[PDB]
Amino acid sequence: AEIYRKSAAETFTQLEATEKGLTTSEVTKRQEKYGFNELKNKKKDPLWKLFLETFKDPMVIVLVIAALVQLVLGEVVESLIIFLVLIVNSIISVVQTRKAESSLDALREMSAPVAKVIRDGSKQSIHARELVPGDVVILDAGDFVPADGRLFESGSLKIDEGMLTGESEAVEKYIDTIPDEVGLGDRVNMVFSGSLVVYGRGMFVVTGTASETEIGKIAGLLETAEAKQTPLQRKLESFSKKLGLGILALCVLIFAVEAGRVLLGDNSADMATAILNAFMFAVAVAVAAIPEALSSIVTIVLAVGTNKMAKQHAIIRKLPAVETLGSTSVICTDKTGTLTQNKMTVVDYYLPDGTKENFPESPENWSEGERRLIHIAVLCNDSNINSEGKELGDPTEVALIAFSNKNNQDYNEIREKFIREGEIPFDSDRKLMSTLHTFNENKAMLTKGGPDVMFARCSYVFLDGEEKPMTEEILAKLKETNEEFSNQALRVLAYGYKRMPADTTELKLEDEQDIVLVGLTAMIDPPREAVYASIEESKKAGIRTVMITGDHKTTAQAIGRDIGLMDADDIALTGQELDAMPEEELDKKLEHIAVYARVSPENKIRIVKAWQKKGKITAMTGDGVNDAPALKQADIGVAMGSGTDVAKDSAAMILTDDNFVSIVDAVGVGRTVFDNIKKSIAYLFAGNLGAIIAILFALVLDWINPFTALQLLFINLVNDSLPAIALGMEKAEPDVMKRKPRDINEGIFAGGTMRAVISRGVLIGIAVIISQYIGMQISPEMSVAMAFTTLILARTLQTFAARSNVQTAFGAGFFSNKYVIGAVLLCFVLYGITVLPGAREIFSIPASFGLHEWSIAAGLALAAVVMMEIIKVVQNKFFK
Ligand SMILES: [Ca+2]
Ligand SMILES: [Mg+2]
């Protein structure tokens, strides 16, 4: 910016320096007033018990204190079960919040940038945190540029600038003083901090050592510190406490028979302490109706979803948001590095004949000119693939070796067969590089370069025999094949094989005369193969996708056509067009275009804001600083595993393997988490209402109260904590995909839940009431005890089809979930122990043998379940 307009000498006039040396007379002083290089002193678990952290949501811990004031004066009377159920619920929550695995990789991402620099006229390797403005620092293909600056020494230099602004192909570097560019960085020819150099030699004056750097300026947009809530943070419990509190208001009128409420004589003049019993039954009813475990359910169902992503090399942070990827509808992407592999690979070879479209593997089934094209493509390289595959050197030569890997013929054998006989390394001004080798013991000249440069020098072409191209019908074919490749946006390279006569001396600068052309190699950064299926899965899932990248438009059109995103009927859209019209018309054209090219990091904010503004939950995936603002403005951010540490820290999802199908897997676990969180609470809410109507029906006819305070705590202990948690582990529901993303305008009150729990609660109420009326034969220990066991049996047995709203409890239901089987078994045996313990016998004193009517009561409980079963048939029938 601007620095480019002035020369390399005028730029340092403002910034005190001599471009060389910079003794400590200023370095030891002005660096402090200038500030330090690093921005990392910005933005960067206690777990003493961490159960207090869970003790901050609306609780019953204050309510349970009132239990002691009534439980005192009796050694066996005291009931601490309500106190101890909640602490156990927190214990499982905190241990499942730990997940036996922390948000690791926190120690993995270490920058530790080092720069080889000249201080006080001496050669050293000073830490990048100590670079001073105006400093003279050399560059090589073993590190990256540590600070923004202006180049002084220029030759055979290009850098991988695409990490911060998004050109897949590297940009060349040379000294220039063109003032009339924009300043994005695609042509400024200025070193931008953090960018990896390709190869060559670099030596530049360090202009900016501060947050003023372009990478630091990107963090200036990150500096806004945008903190928001989670889309599921809306709390229906706030309405539930209103309903629960209202029941308590009616509950003090439930015990209207008391002398203080009956307004009648014939009873004790004093109100007879039954208020405490009424108050005891009131809070016990209230704590039964209160979905206390619902808050604990949220943590457990989310933690396992994060744990499942940990086995897919998709470790994530910010646990409370994993269903967001399940609820998204539009996905923002980022061409460079995010879809492409950030590794240039040759995908199409063309020869003037070019008979074969796929390069044959075994050389025995090759073509005639294919050998020469490979030989020049393996010998005219400056890279090397070591025993691990380090790909040291320029990426284009790595693609040539990658081509040599396709045929299984390693480049090392040919490089060993003909080591070298002298060569002219590539220089920026003359885009050519020629290497001399031996063919059938005869010295041969091999030169490679740009397409049009060779088309000016393609004085011969050989595929079966060397001959003049007559500058027509073959040179035109080179023009049309170069043109279509440019239409495909491929950095096509042309290769030539010249017959050096007999003994060859050193190759002079002008030896590429009468160079016989071999063929053309077309290379382009290809998208990862994982994104092919990831789109067909997303396309059928009703999740729209848009690609945004600051690369050139021609590349943006080529990709997407290979992915299916491009409409193939309209031109792509560029960032400058957004400014041409108001943002409301941008919303109009937002849905009729899916590719955006040449967009600033701020241009990503406006589009991602518009997607959020239209009510669709958006997600941003990318690598590099050119994506950090969009990640935060998106309520869910996905950082590529190979991106800059700025991107990984800013976003909320990391894919260490750099896989892309994990996003679909993260979508699926997010959808299942929402269904589990929408069904686990549906089960407890439905059964809790069944208890309410049981009390309510006894009110209208003033039946004996059908429940006892000690058992309300017990049913809650066994049908509000364990079964709810187990249902949160519900198997992968049938076709969790193929469903359009859940509408964010609808809460848990959607038809799928309310139109089911309402019927579910009524069926419970009918069952328990029948038990009371059947139990009306004897009021004590028969009318009140018989109803308790039916509710416990009915409540814990209807979980069979509360496991899934699609799969039948028996037709498609099995012991698929060991958690629900264990929870069902544990609550069953625990109740079975406590019905015939021989020590307590809340049931009638005759227990475990006077079961002749316990069968019908148990059968009555199953009758509701089988009547609940036909509701499943109703779900699967046409009557819906
Ligand atoms: Ca409860
Ligand atoms: Mg990128």
Numbering used by the authors: 1 to 880
What wording appears in the published article?
Ca2+-ATPases encompass the P2A and P2B subtypes of the P-type family, consisting of typically ten membrane-spanning helical segments, M1-10, connected to three cytosolic domains: the nucleotide binding (N), the phosphorylation (P) with a catalytic aspartic acid residue conserved in all P-type ATPases, and the actuator (A) domain, which is involved in dephosphorylation and contains an essential TGES-motif containing loop. LMCA1 shares 34–39% sequence identity with mammalian SERCA (ATP2A genes), but it transports only a single calcium ion for each transport cycle, similar to the plasma membrane Ca2+-ATPase (PMCA, ATP2B genes) and the secretory pathway Ca2+-ATPase (SPCA, ATP2C genes) that share however a slightly lower sequence identity with LMCA1 (30-34%). P-type ATPases perform their active transport with energy from ATP hydrolysis via autoformation and breakdown of a phosphoenzyme and with structural transitions alternating between inward- and outward-oriented states.
We have determined a structure of the so far elusive calcium-occluded and ADP-insensitive [Ca]E2P intermediate for LMCA1 by cryo-EM using a G4 insertion mutant form, which is known to pause at this intermediate. To investigate G4-LMCA1 by cryo-EM, we incubated saposin-solubilized G4-LMCA1 with 1 mM Ca2+ and 1 mM ATP at room temperature for 2–10 min before plunge-freezing and cryo-EM imaging. We denote this state [Ca]E2P, as it displays features of both [Ca]E1P and E2P, with the TM domain adopting a calcium-bound conformation and the cytoplasmic domains assuming an E2P-like, ADP insensitive conformation. Further visual inspection reveals closed ion pathways, and density consistent with a single calcium ion bound and occluded at a binding site between M4 and M6, equivalent of SERCA site II. However, the map for the [Ca]E2P form of G4-LMCA1 reveals no density for the Glu292 side chain oriented towards the calcium ion. The Glu292 residue of the calcium site appears flexible in the [Ca]E2P state (indicated by poor density and an orientation away from the Ca2+ site), and hence the calcium site has lower coordination by protein side chains, which may prime solvation of the Ca2+ ion and its release in the subsequent step. Visual inspection of the cryo-EM density map indicates no density for bound nucleotide at the N domain despite a 1 mM background of ATP/ADP in the cryo-EM sample.
